[model samples]
Target: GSSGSSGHQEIKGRKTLATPAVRRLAMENNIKLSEVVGSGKDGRILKEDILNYLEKQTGAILPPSGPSSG
Candidate 1:
């Protein structure tokens, strides 16, 4: 039985944590870290989190950073 439908949880005082790579990817790709949820320890954002967010937003998984030879 469902007692409540709302699953709103407010996070105001907590600061966002992420490594340089994560921040770089998010910033360069125009994904706001504020809107992404972290699954790492202490709620830190990881590369997986960013990639997952990108997949959800674009509906296509992003390839790893590297130049392909012709």
Candidate 2:
């Protein structure tokens, strides 16, 4: 018994928003799909989106090019 709408639905009790293939990419990237913000139709996550997330996370982890500190 389920509604016939694929409207932005998440896997039960899961925060992931992507297809199996995309999920596979996430796994390969060692990124938590749950934490990624989907940027596709119906909020489905895309590879491009994942890359952006990676960039953001990596940027935070990696050192920044800071100007001469005061």
Q: Where does candidate 1 clash, by residue pair?
A: none
- The positional error of residue 31 in candidate 1, measured at the CA in angstroms, is 0.3
lDDT, each prediction: 0.80, 0.76
True-vs-predicted CA distance for residue 17, candidate 2, Å: 2.6
Residue-wise lDDT of candidate 2 within 1-70, one digit each (tens)? 8669656854653656678778888889888777787898878898887888888886564444686332
Clash counts per candidate, in order, are 0, 0
Cα lDDT tens digits for candidate 1, 1-70: 7588667676684567999888888988899787777888878899899988877787645675678422
Local distance difference test, candidate 1: 0.80
- Using TM-score, give the best candidate's number: 1
TM-score of 2: 0.59
Q: Tell me which residue pairs clash in candidate 2.
A: none
RMSD of candidates 1 onward, in order: 10.6, 12.9
